[PDB]
């Protein structure tokens, strides 16, 4: 049943395409599997994952410290592909390379493989379980720390949830194979990271506190972002029960000159290790990591060539071969992250579909302050509007909502307020001042952010802006007016729901996402194990004649042929005619045009 | 008679399509709009008061750094294919002047732009300077020559080569970047007399090669820079340029060459690169804050990858610096903005390059070749060997006994490097034409020589020379010379046309024709150009300088008897009727 | 102006096309028709200047008097009228009057008008009738002219008052009719009596047609015998004819009946006989045959191409059977031959409106219905979704016959019955089960009375409440003010319009004031050749049209464009060397 599960889907999908896949651009038909690296077949070495286990958290900071060497993390698993392919990079082709950044980087600090959008995303639009995807990782890179991107006041959802259910998602994902968690808040605000960095202790293990990179320190026009901003944040966070200390330039905007003097200042204000993560957007991001490295951070992230540049992290391969030979050479074989990222490279080409139009690095960045995962997403949302030939007076309009909302940082869920502001700005033709004006139909996300539900900026909201879109205000920490979960009770719901017990990290995915996992729990009884079909498949079904083998466990080979495609029966349905590992099998899919 | 002409390409192309562009993708189904702008005077008029060996020492003394455009030439060269029109490109030449009056000067002519701008744009590349000059009075205005070849393909007499540089003087350049394909100063130094010769500035340049910071690699070690840098001003150069054609130049390898070349020369220093690296934007930084005089971007539309690193960006990096170029950042993004509506006209020529590429480290082929060879190489049905290609390319350069690899050097190092992918042979196993070439004597003589070994095999009889190839080719007759092509062409010819004829005789000669037949496509705009006009489609277009003619595309007849087709327009409310063969 | 007006029909149809034709089949692309060469130089004088010399009574004793039989030539009627849904144009029936007129002087008439042609010229072709009339009658000076006349209508839809008729008739002579063959759908001659008058006022042929029905020789179908012929000759007779026609509308007399009957009819009266008929049996010729041999004074037949089946028997065989013999019609093969081939390259081109029939039926002699009417009431059976059922149809309409006592069924009776047939299939109930406005409008006495009456039954649970009369319609009619009743006409078309306009409006208010507008909008459309009236021009196209008898417009189609963004189309035109552009709406 497993089988007649997975026939149905590639019937499906045969007849129907998919969604996502349908009425977008397709790969070249000839274009070659990705070919996993060949293996020598020797075991594996020791790194920070045994580190880790065996220091404990507070000791391998300090280990992190006095590293010379500068430490890497690879973003390509989660980042990479959020950003330049919207995140819809499947299990498949993450899984399969493991088990090589295992045997050829064993160096590496870290792989970020988990959280972001890839949580949502995976279910939501791969038809597959982020549980399975991280536990296939786990099992394949046993030596690395697998990091994950964690919002503070989120977990990985897309509300803010009462403490107990905050709690419960941290243990379940430690549990489930996380070792480095970097959680930030869209507000720099550190009441609202407590509740996130004691959990993550209390599961003993590593605790990235992020600070937001925005504006510009070396600019006295724009005093509220300054160095001593960071400095003190860095101090709280430390005495917050950071083990690490993040700069987290998510729409990529530290320049050189910046990072020479942030990172000598960071390394003195704190005891803490600091670790740099940023974007390319700008075209300069690399100058900017090495200005870094130059300055003595202990960590920086980068992505695999193939997927580095523009809105992603800059190029992994590059800065590395950069620093060869250098005091602080990084430790990792150019010709190994060259043969993964060939890996990639092949992987990539079965993405074509949701390939962005961005053509190259853009200083407008500088403008705007679009997060890097976010600039293409509002694009789309531009068109979609019907404004992609003034795609500029929304960007000059972003920058103007940042600046009356009292310049603020601007990320997930913030950006996504200040960017419904923007396109409001230009499509209802309405200025700076007319927000500000005494004689709107607020958007929705827009009066939550003034009420309190995102949290409290530095110094508070512009009073008068709050007044005319709102309604009194709260100037509480939003999760501590919600009620505690009764879990027990709220277990037994989606379990009625399902008709079956369901498992502690299933539990957790309900709690995030209720409703994107109820339905990919039932997509999951009709289709089966999808998540084991290659890309291709995945996306295409099967040509006419065209043979497939796929994986229905470790060990266990199904051997499938579309044989025939019928017309569309008087009922309305479609049979593919297969084989199956030799024996002929019907499946009825109905006809969806 | 003009506008007659025009109307026979619009109707050709209509029904035919464009060769180059009606079997490549198609525009996304919005017009470049010229951002609305006295000119301050600028560094044109600072070279015309002081001259070019004064001027060099101006450079030199400046605090701020100084920019150079690549835009016009590098950046379309690098990812379109060089396709990029006059038309586009003078437009916004008099915004750059009023906006950005501190650059030092724009790269707009020179490299594949002479050859590819008759050949597959049917336009005359010495009218479009003349159009930059006439829009930029106050900026520089840059080629890129290439001492033995001058712009053309093959070598050519030492007469032939200083007529050139007298005409490309007259047609406006301000400043000469040349440079040898083997780094053989006995090679430029007949190019810089001529430059020098026609009191217009040398810019003698160093390709970079290797890694300077790498002890196992010493072929290419800092004392060899510095040394071909005191040459070069022995040699008479004005400005010593660093071309990193392939994008090799590491931040740690700049802070020690920028300082050191300095320190070893009078002259100022000019940075020149490529972003395959990714990181491209790094070195530049690196060579800023080494005290690099100058340096090349593109604008951000035209930035990244093959193409130069982000202007926009390099400069916001830098304000407030104590080295701050001095250019609005506004401004810079509203010319961004330009040629993003340009580039989106291009999309035939776009090539698949997804990002950065460390790769590069390993083959080192030159950004601007990278495009054509993968396309090659997909030509002869090796698509898919593309990553032992460049293997192959690598490999060979070695066999070569380590050379400096840009055109033409370059192309045999690609001619090679297929041939042993196709072949299934290795360095250890019926060469190419141009293997053979080269390693005769023709292309130049490296630092070495060519291998024994590798000579005796490819030559299989035949004698090298290692003298200077162009002493070898006779002065040729420029007198009876421009009797025979004024003779074919059955008209007088200019001196322009004479110079376009001795660098390109088959291309020029063909231009004349289609110059002939079309008249002046030049002045088209590129949607329509590429594309004719869709039907009822309304035209303004600028023969003269003060007359425009509204053409309108009002119908298209069926395949007649002849098998000619009709096209109906409206011209300026006159109705006209345009006959071209069907060739479908 | 003239010609700015068609270039925008050719415009209009280029781009959007005719609607009676843009779906029905096409005309097989890869053979104009040639108007046969001209030889002789004068035309010879027949009937036509026969008639001008003895005048109607004498010319028919002239008639009965000769030997040959004479021959009448149906193809610009009847002929197209069954086989082409009465498509037939202008443009094609004028150009060979000039070939009939010198190749085959020694025919007795050409029928060429009545029937339906007169109002579907103006509703289905942008054709005047009387201008097609008076292009036969340049063509042909030295024939007769032939109409059918319905009588109580003319050539109208409904019936009509008395001076109606009459004024119609008055025009119908001026625009060129020679013989009038009138009919009444019940043979009922009081119906006839003010026609028949009013074709003696004239000065002109009067043919008293009696219809026939039936089987004489089936002494089990009596009610329509011999006598019942041959009295209403002698009624018709007494009534004023210049001769009597035997209508056989649906083809139903057999040859053993011809030899009887028209013996007989001889016998019963002076006057000369003229013989109408239809192949739908496929053995009308024998008939035909028949007639001749007992001594019958004209038939009607129709050129080969277009004869056969629900059409006239075929003219060229008939004159090859008679041949030689003392009858012998004096006509040559070979022209015939000639003039059929130029109708086959005429008929080609009106393949849009070829019916689906095969061949020969015997089932005819079942339902009776008008080879003018069989396809009509097959395509309205489909119209009702009824094709899979055709056959219930015929015999139900049989059975709707009997039903009403054994009737005469002809326009618009026939139509009657139709209606009748066709809901008894739809509403599925058989005769006992019976025992729509035309069978209401019948029964109530509209449209006559039958030799017996209507049947009581049948006229009380029909009518319903409304209370019949037996007296001819038009007498019910008042006399219409012709004086007022022309100014509604010029009024409506702010300008005069002449004599045969207006009888256009007596019998088609609503078609002619249709037609009216088109012809200010698109001008002479007849002028133009009949693959460029329903299809337009193709890119690079020629055209050679006659604006004037003198004057000819060459016009070459050289593009069309797309649809401009106010749905416009524009069409690219030379007109006589000259360029021209004419700008016309996207209707798809
Ligand atoms: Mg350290
Ligand atoms: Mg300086
Ligand atoms: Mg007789
Ligand atoms: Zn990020
Ligand atoms: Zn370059
Ligand atoms: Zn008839």
Same mark, same amino acid.
Request: net charge negative.
């Given at each position: ?271 803490? +290790? ?23 951070? %202990?960590?920086? %992230? ?68 679009? +997060? ?222």
């Amino acid at each position: 049943d497993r089988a007649t599960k997975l026939l149905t889907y590639l019937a499906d999908v045969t007849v129907n395409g998919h969604p996502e896949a349908k009425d977008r651009p397709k790969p070249l038909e000839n274009a070659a599997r990705p070919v996993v690296p060949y293996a020598n077949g020797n075991g594996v070495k020791d790194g920070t994952k045994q580190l880790l286990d065996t220091l404990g958290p507070k000791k391998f900071g300090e280990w992190m410290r006095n590293e010379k060497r500068v430490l890497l993390t690879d973003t390509t698993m989660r980042d990479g592909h959020q950003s330049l392919l919207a995140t819809r990079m499947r299990t498949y082709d993450i899984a399969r390379i493991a088990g090589t950044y295992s045997h050829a980087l064993p160096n590496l600090l870290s792989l970020e493989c988990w959280g972001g959008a890839t949580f949502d995303v995976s279910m939501r639009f791969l038809t597959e379980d982020p549980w399975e995807r991280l536990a296939l990782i786990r099992e394949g890179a046993p030596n690395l720390l697998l990091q994950m991107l964690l919002r503070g006041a989120n977990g990985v959802g897309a509300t803010n949830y009462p403490d107990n259910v905050v709690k419960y998602f941290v243990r379940q994902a430690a549990k489930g194979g996380i070792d480095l968690f970097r959680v930030f808040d869209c507000l720099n605000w550190v009441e609202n990271m407590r509740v996130s960095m004691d959990a993550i202790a209390e599961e003993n293990k590593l605790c990235e506190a992020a600070i937001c990179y925005t504006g510009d320190i070396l600019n006295s026009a724009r005093p509220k972002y300054d160095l001593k901003y960071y400095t003190n944040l860095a101090v709280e966070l430390e005495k917050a029960g950071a083990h690490i200390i993040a700069v987290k330039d998510m729409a990529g905007l530290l320049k050189p000159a910046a990072a020479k003097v942030l990172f000598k200042a960071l390394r003195e204000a704190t005891g803490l +290790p600091i670790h740099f993560h940023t974007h390319d957007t700008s075209g300069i991001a690399a100058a900017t990591v090495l200005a870094a490295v130059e300055a003595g951070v %202990d960590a920086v %992230d980068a992505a695999m060539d193939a997927l580095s540049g523009n809105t992603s992290q800059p190029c992994l391969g590059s800065i590395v071969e950069a620093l060869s030979g250098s005091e602080r050479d990084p430790g990792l074989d150019p010709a190994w992250i060259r043969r993964i990222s060939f890996y990639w490279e092949a992987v990539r080409n079965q993405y074509a579909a949701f390939e962005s139009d961005l053509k190259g690095p853009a200083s407008e960045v500088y403008l705007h302050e679009m +997060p890097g995962g976010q600039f293409t997403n509002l694009k789309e949302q531009a068109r979609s509007l019907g404004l992609e030939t003034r795609w500029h007076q929304v960007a000059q309009a972003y920058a103007d909502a940042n600046q009356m909302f009292g310049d603020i940082v601007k990320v997930t869920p913030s950006s996504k307020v200040v960017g419904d502001m923007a396109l409001m700005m230009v499509s209802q033709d309405l200025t700076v001042a007319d927000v500000v004006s005494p004689d709107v139909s607020f958007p929705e996300s827009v009066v939550s952010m003034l009420k309190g539900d995102l949290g409290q900026p530095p110094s508070g909201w512009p009073e008068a802006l709050q007044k005319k879109a709102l309604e009194k205000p709260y100037t509480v920490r939003p999760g501590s007016l919600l009620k505690e979960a009764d879990l027990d009770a709220e277990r037994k719901v989606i379990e009625k729901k399902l008709e079956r017990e369901v498992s502690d990290f299933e539990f957790a995915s309900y709690l995030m996402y209720p409703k994107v996992f109820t339905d990919f729990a039932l997509a999951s009884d009709t289709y089966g194990p999808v998540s084991v079909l290659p890309t291709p498949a995945y996306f295409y079904g099967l040509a006419d004649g065209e043979e497939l083998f796929a994986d229905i466990e470790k060990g266990k080979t199904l051997v499938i042929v579309n044989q025939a495609v019928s017309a569309t029966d008087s009922q309305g349905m479609v049979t593919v005619f297969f084989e199956l590992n030799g024996q002929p099998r019907r499946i009825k899919v109905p006809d969806r045009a």
